[PDB]
Amino acid sequence: HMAISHVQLFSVPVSDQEKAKDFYVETVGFDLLADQPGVHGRWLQVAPKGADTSLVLVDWFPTMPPGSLRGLLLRTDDVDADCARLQERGVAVDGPKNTPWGRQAMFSDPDGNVIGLNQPS
Amino acid sequence: HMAISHVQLFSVPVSDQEKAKDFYVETVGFDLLADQPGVHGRWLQVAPKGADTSLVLVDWFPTMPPGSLRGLLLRTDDVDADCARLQERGVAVDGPKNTPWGRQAMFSDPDGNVIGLNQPS
């Protein structure tokens, strides 16, 4: 067996990092973990409070154009209340809709990366 | 206050999903969580055993070409031993080397998605 425990972090491709920061922190409600110089650009790291795996809002990977990410699903304890909050904050939400694997909704960040919410049954 | 607890999963763009399955499960040592029909194709989901955030090995997002992912970092409790294991298993590993964010190494999957390992100080 390998000694890998979990995904530490993964990257979300953005253009304007200030607008992305404000979106993930203020609109989606993540904590800001880091905002500091990095090797390839400004290192801007956000995550839900208490979560093991965080997100880095990057602009330096040519193979990941801004807004190109799909298939990111966030677990929530209250999808209905979260979608109403997002709507109040000016976010267009698709759903929620019931599925076989939980009640789910979708929305986009400022660059067009698509984020899902899932509350399991 | 948003009710989001954590990232449930995120997506890694691959071409040959059977080859990707074998790489992530056999070579990298992830657990196979699910392998079943999904809404958009074969749903193939893997994770480090016991981890909250999992990976889906997808082929259905045009904006995520196979092998395009970068900036994915796995936390490990023994980066040196994991690098030696990957080398034994026929994988090229760059590192491990000490860094300011921890002792890190990099390797790629069959499509060229770039995966990091990090053992924090």
From TrEMBL, chains A, B:
<dbReference type="GO" id="GO:0046872">
    <property type="term" value="F:metal ion binding"/>
</dbReference>
<feature type="binding site">
    <location>
        <position position="104"/>
    </location>
    <ligand>
        <name>riboflavin</name>
    </ligand>
</feature>
<dbReference type="InterPro" id="IPR004360">
    <property type="entry name" value="Glyas_Fos-R_dOase_dom"/>
</dbReference>
<feature type="compositionally biased region" description="Polar residues">
    <location>
        <begin position="116"/>
        <end position="121"/>
    </location>
</feature>
<dbReference type="InterPro" id="IPR029068">
    <property type="entry name" value="Glyas_Bleomycin-R_OHBP_Dase"/>
</dbReference>
<dbReference type="GO" id="GO:0051213">
    <property type="term" value="F:dioxygenase activity"/>
</dbReference>
<keyword id="KW-0560">Oxidoreductase</keyword>
<feature type="binding site">
    <location>
        <position position="101"/>
    </location>
    <ligand>
        <name>riboflavin</name>
    </ligand>
</feature>
<dbReference type="InterPro" id="IPR037523">
    <property type="entry name" value="VOC_core"/>
</dbReference>
<feature type="binding site">
    <location>
        <position position="52"/>
    </location>
    <ligand>
        <name>Ca(2+)</name>
    </ligand>
</feature>
<dbReference type="Pfam" id="PF00903">
    <property type="entry name" value="Glyoxalase"/>
</dbReference>
<keyword id="KW-0479">Metal-binding</keyword>
<feature type="region of interest" description="Disordered">
    <location>
        <begin position="91"/>
        <end position="121"/>
    </location>
</feature>
<feature type="binding site">
    <location>
        <position position="36"/>
    </location>
    <ligand>
        <name>riboflavin</name>
    </ligand>
</feature>
<keyword id="KW-0106">Calcium</keyword>
<feature type="domain" description="VOC">
    <location>
        <begin position="3"/>
        <end position="120"/>
    </location>
</feature>
<keyword id="KW-0223">Dioxygenase</keyword>
<protein>
    <submittedName>
        <fullName>Glyoxalase/bleomycin resisance protein/dioxygenase</fullName>
    </submittedName>
</protein>
